């Protein structure tokens, strides 16, 4: 139906994103969306504040995919609705 894409920091995703969501940070949004996703898909995009969410949007529509929309309020709004996270293996030398 639809594919979700994480465009906050790896290690902010690491801490949690929505379940299926795709890592792909700002930086190499366009690179990896380009090589991994067909420009007719519906993407749904979500980063950490709107002001992100808009850039990584912004870039996926100029670089030429069709259908890109945002997800309002991001991980807070889609766990507010009692939307299923997923936390992945990492370590922290802290
Ligand atoms: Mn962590
Ligand atoms: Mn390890
Ligand atoms: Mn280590």
Do not use: C
């Not at 940070?25 to 990896?32: G, S």
């Not at 007719?40 to 912004?58: C, H, K, L, P």
């Not at 609705?81 to 922290?92: K, Q, V």
């Amino acid at each position: 139906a639809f594919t979700i894409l994480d465009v906050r920091d790896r290690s902010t995703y690491n801490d949690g994103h929505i379940m299926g969501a795709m890592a792909m940070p700002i930086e190499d949004l366009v690179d990896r969306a380009s090589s991994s996703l067909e420009k007719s898909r519906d993407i749904y995009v979500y980063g950490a504040g709107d002001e992100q969410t808009s850039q990584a949007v912004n870039l996926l529509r100029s670089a030429g995919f069709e259908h890109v929309s945002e997800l309002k309020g991001g991980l807070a709004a889609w766990k507010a609705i009692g939307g299923p996270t997923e936390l992945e293996h990492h370590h922290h030398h802290h």
